[PDB]
């Protein structure tokens, strides 16, 4: 219902663009039953609508090879209509078409180069001799002949805009040649089709800026005036300015663009004069659309603004938008990343009555954006855009354009051997070999990362699930935690329960909590934000909670996102136990975390994982299910886990076969993962020492240690110490036993 | 302007956005602005010499006006264009719908009763949105790319009560456009147990707005403040969500430290703005999640810090005292640490009603387990009564975690079955008793004795 | 041929002394395009509207002489985050930058380069794709890179035979 | 000041109390002081220009 204004409904005029076998520039061919349906005879002049306010005229001809539901047209008519193969256009009879008295055509500059002969004599005169071709202003038509075929721009038609080129019509090629770059910029013009995702938002925008102009009779009959104020808000890169360009390109209404800072002037009352001039220009030009980009630049809250000029500008905009002298059918659009920064009086019905959230697209929306951005790119057959759409979790559309550009840049890099930077031009063979493969898109995906997270980017040391020894159940739980809600939301909908999104790792130091976080950051298919505990805290009042709010907002925007706190007890500590801690800054941070984690806001796929070295001091409300649902205890490894840890540490290390890791794991009772890693590091250091002494010996004789050996491991072991003392295990086991005995039932069985 | 008004007398001079050219001269840092304020003062003083000129000014920031301009002899009369009541909203709706083609089933009285915080521009927006929905219902019959419309389509076009109901669903007061948050669709039947709390909240919301005359007759003012205190996860924020979704009152939900700002004087201004926009949308509910961040005990942390939190709590106390009973602004606070709430906040007249949301008992646990599993396919042999029996110390969050763990176990089983079927080529209709049995061993009691 | 627009925004970041301004000067000298240099504080003015007008004039000058390279040194001074900035002038300057680099009218052939010691102090809207496409980290050089730097800086000086630049590179 | 000193190319600039004018850009909340530090950095970069102007700060 909301998107009902987007359907075409397959009217008889609707036809699918298809390639032309022999159709010339000025003619198109249809199927005979299609003409009989439309009551069109052969040779009748016809009018074809296109995208972005374009129309063309052609001579309809009967072609049996042409499909029933398709219209054949060559590249010239497609480029005139700004349409591609598969596009739907409407064909209608054009009445009262008369022979053109005179037509003025301007050739393209790049085509006329290399042609000594007169453009009119060589091309125009024979092409338009008894042509009887219908043409319209703005069309490009290409004429073959000479060394290079010549493209002409029909700038002037008499009568305008439709005319038949009769032999008596005078054709003249004089004039400034049209730049190729200008026509190229005309071709790559943004329409409503260039916006991917935002289908409901685009539907509302078309309802408000297109429908009242196309069918004002609806609003006139129903006795209401349509909305005239649209505020586009959203995070950066979601496509607000893109929608503004699309509206500017695809409206018949006069378009006036206002950029916030451009309004400002040093003179007294000159900025208000600029605003008044803009609104007067819009009113003078009948239906007009005013778009104010960066609205927060010139529309701050008057209560929060110190300068008098800015407050006067806000008041001037308030009066122009809705004052005693009302607007004369003028649509005002605005775009901002900070809708709450705007003045509250501008947001009412009189001024900005509709607020449109151009939000972060989902998987299908970003697949659509990728298709839009790659429609022009040369792709190999191996490229799968659906996989790339599934991989890019937090991308907004500018990030997808970045990914496509990175893929193309990598494709160009792969040809830097055949290409020479210095040479004048590139060989045609290299150009033909140039394409964007799925490997380039995979590389771009690897480099890709949502822009909103650019500030929260940390270099992670590339840990894999294999690098961690033991903790197999914890690995499975983490993988399922991050993967199930993301890859199988339908299962959760079928069982009608939201996923749990909270995990707290607690245990003795050096047992693998941060290692698990690294494995998640490198392996799990979601965005990852790493937070050291105290980095959010700030000296200023209310800014630590602002940092908490901002980081949770970044995790929400980049969802699915994993939000890891390396030291939770620093940022999350029990309330009321601090005599100082500022004006209760730590307690306010605790409460802000509580609200952000479980409050009245709608829950998103934000997986919040915290690692604490001592969980008894964390606030009890933090551990409440719905916040850190699962409290996972990472204890000292047992003998099997110690074998796994020793193998994982020495997997990349060349170790002699005589070394028995089972015996090491048997002896090292109470050792943590860091302890065993230190044993391996000490063995490596001893081997390096022996190799260095051997090299010194060879140097002395001039003027050994292929792998770590058994004696190296023994000498490393004699230094080994048990880092975690028995009382520490006692404390952690105490917390774990409190957690276990909280349930009260070792085995739960349903009565039969 | 004033001379031309005198030339053509009797004259009226309308000054829209008076605060644009008439701020307080003490706060002004521009010489030309101060000279303009002085010129306005001089002209309005000399207005007495002028025969029949009358100056009317409009502003939505009356406090920003220079005080001298509000004295005797100059702008001495002030008219408060306030928020309309139910009958006034009905009149505004009648005015705006006079030209539209309403159907017979429309009932503007209901629409007037629903719009609790609308001011007249909001009602115009509501009418426009209803008509736009009516036009949308015909977008199937008429395409936008169509050049013209059949006259029968126009003849059928009309606004019905369903369109107005859709508009009311979308309609919200313009003032509450910055405080608006996405709230999950929580319903009273989503909450299990807490029946006395539900009834008390429903009465405390409905009785003051519907029947103030009885309270005036008996001479007792209705309680305008409620605090929720209890163990974490027992249903305070859930009750707030249910109040937001179900009650016909505007809801303002603010996080605790949302108001605090480093710039001196801004946190008090934030409290003033939130309370003022609560008054403008009355009947309104102003919910303070994690109240202890907003309101902590004074003097406990006075020495450590600049003292801005004390100013914030003093401003909050001033706003709680400043409300008249005629404005129906219910204030609800939630905290799981009532022991650190400032004692002044609980004093009579402010947050009077203190409600203990306790750890649920066996019947309440049955209700919670049924409410959570209401939309879930659960096997018949799964006995919820035994689950309530065994989870003695569990809270509502704990039971929800048990159900979620059972759901995840079922999803894991289904995923593994699908993987196995794909493997053999190259299930789990509902949650079962074994799933809950496995989920119960992971279960823990979150709140200690 | 490949159907993309090459990236138009470069943000050089790193600790002081890495050579961001040096790389900007090298690009200015060795490229066949018009070069415009902007310093952060020099844009600032007391009068409202002067600084945005200076930015507009610089970008218009680059657009006329296109293709062009605009280098904005000390981007952190000129472009703080608008949420964390109190002054209206700075916020309007950031908005003017946002509009100039990516607005309804897009720059056809102008390359915008910037250097900043603290990239995280930049407004996140600038670190978006369309404006500052890529961020390049000019970091601390390794031993061989700093040996190359020593060779560059010692080429003009006359050096005795005993001078061993690899040792100096190892020690520093 | 730098332009005026460079005009009289045999010049010595003396910046007394440089600590007040030039704090840490990150450490100080004030944006005026971070901007003045950046401007001083820019002036020092182009200060030499193979000119007799020298700068001494206290
Ligand atoms: N939904 C989308 N579909 C297709 N392309 C998109 C979409 N959103 C953004 N883009 C592309 O990514 C870039 C985003 O720039 P744009 O000016 O449209 O963003 P914006 O939302 O206005 O950002 P800002 O808030 O910083 O002004 C453009 O190159 C645009 O073509
Ligand atoms: N299961 C494991 N497998 C392999 N190495 C491990 C394992 N557990 C710990 N380590 C080793 O421990 C070191 C890092 O430990 P990590 O950072 O994961 O500890 P932690 O539990 O987060 O401790 P802390 O409480 O001190 O923050 C590395 O040398 C890593 O190899
Ligand atoms: N009576 C109940 N019926 C149904 N679900 C409940 C009930 N009480 C709690 N829950 C569920 O358990 C969790 C408790 O969250 P809720 O927002 O109600 O907690 P709270 O009382 O505000 O606690 P906190 O002090 O931790 O903020 C939610 O997932 C909620 O859906
Ligand atoms: N990578 C380098 N290779 C060679 N010389 C270098 C390098 N980095 C710095 N230098 C030398 O040191 C000087 C200082 O470098 P430069 O002024 O570019 O540093 P910067 O920190 O990038 O600058 P700014 O902070 O002003 O942007 C250069 O002019 C050059 O002489
Ligand atoms: Mg924009
Ligand atoms: Mg750690
Ligand atoms: Mg809560």
UniProtKB/Swiss-Prot annotation, chain B:
Substitution effect: residue 28 to A: Does not affect methylation by VCPKMT
Modified residues (Phosphothreonine): 148
Modified residues (N6,N6,N6-trimethyllysine): 27
Binding site for ATP 1: 60, 96
GO terms under biological process: aggresome assembly; ATP metabolic process; autophagosome maturation; autophagy; cellular response to arsenite ion; cellular response to heat; cellular response to misfolded protein; cytoplasm protein quality control
Consequence recorded when altering residue 27 to L/Q/R: Abolishes methylation by VCPKMT
Impact when changing residue 99 to H: In IBMPFD1; uncertain significance
Statement: the UniProt record of this protein carries the keyword Ubl conjugation: yes
Assembly and binders: Homohexamer. Forms a ring-shaped particle of 12.5 nm diameter, that displays 6-fold radial symmetry. Part of a ternary complex containing STX5A, NSFL1C and VCP. NSFL1C forms a homotrimer that binds to one end of a VCP homohexamer. The complex binds to membranes enriched in phosphatidylethanolamine-containing lipids and promotes Golgi membrane fusion. Binds to a heterodimer of NPLOC4 and UFD1, binding to this heterodimer inhibits Golgi-membrane fusion. Interaction with VCIP135 leads to dissociation of the complex via ATP hydrolysis by VCP.
Described purpose of this protein according to its UniProt entry: Necessary for the fragmentation of Golgi stacks during mitosis and for their reassembly after mitosis. Involved in the formation of the transitional endoplasmic reticulum (tER). The transfer of membranes from the endoplasmic reticulum to the Golgi apparatus occurs via 50-70 nm transition vesicles which derive from part-rough, part-smooth transitional elements of the endoplasmic reticulum (tER). Vesicle budding from the tER is an ATP-dependent process.
Protein name: Transitional endoplasmic reticulum ATPase
Residues of the full protein shown: 289 to 749 of 806
């Amino acid at each position: 219902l909301s998107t009902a204004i987007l359907k075409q409904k397959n009217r008889p005029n609707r036809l699918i663009v298809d390639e032309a076998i022999n159709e010339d520039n000025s003619v198109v061919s249809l199927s005979q039953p299609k003409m009989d349906e439309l009551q069109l005879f052969r040779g009748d002049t016809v009018l074809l609508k296109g995208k972005k306010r374009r129309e063309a005229v052609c001579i309809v001809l009967s072609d049996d090879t042409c499909s029933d539901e398709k219209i054949r047209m060559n590249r010239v008519v497609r480029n005139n209509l700004r349409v591609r193969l598969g596009d739907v256009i409407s064909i209608q009879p054009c009445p009262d078409v008369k022979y053109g008295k005179r037509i003025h055509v301007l050739p393209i500059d790049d085509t006329v180069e290399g042609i000594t002969g007169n453009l009119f004599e060589v091309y125009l005169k024979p092409y338009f001799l008894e042509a009887y071709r219908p043409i319209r202003k703005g069309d490009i038509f290409l004429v073959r002949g000479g060394m290079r075929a010549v493209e002409f721009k029909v700038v002037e038609t008499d009568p305008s805009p439709y005319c038949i080129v009769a032999p008596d019509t005078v054709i003249h090629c004089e004039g400034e040649p049209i730049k190729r770059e200008d026509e190229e910029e005309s071709l790559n013009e943004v329409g409503y089709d260039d916006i991917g995702g935002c289908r409901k938002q685009l539907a509302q925008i078309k309802e408000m800026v297109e429908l009242p102009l196309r069918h004002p009779a609806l609003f006139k009959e129903i006795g209401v005036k349509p909305p005239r104020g649209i505020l586009l808000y959203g995070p950066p890169g979601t496509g607000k300015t893109l929608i503004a360009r699309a509206v500017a390109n695809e409206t018949g209404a006069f378009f006036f663009l206002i950029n916030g800072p451009e309004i400002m002037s040093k003179l007294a009352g000159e900025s208000e004069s600029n605003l008044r001039k803009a609104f007067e220009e819009a009113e003078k030009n009948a239906p007009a659309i005013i778009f104010i980009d960066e609205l927060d630049a010139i529309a701050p809250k008057r209560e929060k603004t110190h300068g008098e000029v800015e407050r006067r500008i806000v008041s001037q905009l308030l009066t122009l938008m809705d004052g005693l002298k009302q607007r004369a059918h003028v649509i005002v659009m605005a775009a901002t990343n900070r809708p709450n920064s705007i003045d509250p009086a501008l947001r009412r019905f009189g001024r900005f009555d509709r607020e449109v959230d151009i939000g972060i697209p989902d998987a299908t929306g970003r697949l659509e954006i990728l298709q839009i951005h790659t429609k022009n790119m040369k792709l190999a057959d191996d490229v799968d855009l659906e996989q790339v759409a599934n991989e890019t979790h937090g991308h907004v559309g500018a990030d997808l354009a970045a990914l496509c550009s990175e893929a193309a840049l990598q494709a160009i890099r792969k040809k830097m051997d055949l290409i020479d930077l210095e040479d004048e031009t590139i060989d045609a063979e290299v150009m033909n070999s140039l394409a964007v493969t799925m490997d380039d898109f995979r590389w771009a995906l690897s480099q890709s990362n949502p822009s909103a997270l650019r500030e929260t980017v940390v270099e992670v040391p590339q840990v894999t699930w294999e690098d961690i020894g033991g903790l197999e159940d914890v690995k499975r739980e983490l993988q399922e935690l991050v993967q199930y809600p993301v890859e199988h939301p339908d299962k959760f909908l079928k069982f009608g329960m939201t996923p749990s999104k909270g995990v707290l790792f607690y245990g003795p130091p050096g047992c693998g909590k941060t290692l698990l976080a690294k494995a998640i950051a490198n392996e799990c298919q979601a965005n990852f934000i790493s937070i050291k505990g105290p980095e959010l805290l700030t000296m200023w009042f209310g800014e630590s909670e602002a940092n908490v709010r901002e980081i949770f907002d970044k995790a929400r925007q980049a969802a699915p996102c994993v939000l890891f706190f390396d030291q939770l007890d620093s940022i999350a500590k029990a309330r009321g136990g601090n005599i100082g801690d500022g004006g209760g800054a730590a307690d306010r941070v605790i409460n802000q975390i509580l609200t952000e984690m479980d409050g009245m806001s709608t829950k998103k796929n934000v997986f919040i994982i915290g690692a604490t070295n001592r969980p008894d001091i964390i606030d009890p409300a933090i551990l409440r299910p719905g916040r850190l649902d699962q409290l996972i205890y990472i204890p000292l490894p047992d003998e099997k886990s110690r074998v796994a840890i020793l193998k994982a540490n020495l997997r990349k290390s060349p170790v002699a076969k005589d070394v028995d890791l089972e015996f090491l794991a048997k002896m090292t009772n109470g050792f943590s993962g860091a302890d065993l890693t230190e044993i391996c590091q000490r063995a490596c250091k001893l081997a390096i020492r022996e190799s260095i002494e051997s090299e010194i010996r060879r140097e002395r004789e001039r003027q050994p240690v292929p792998e770590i050996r058994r004696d190296h491991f023994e000498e490393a072991m004699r230094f080994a110490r048990r880092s975690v003392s028995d009382n520490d295990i006692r404390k952690y086991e105490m917390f774990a036993q409190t957690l276990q005995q909280s349930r009260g039932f070792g085995s739960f069985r349903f009565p039969s």
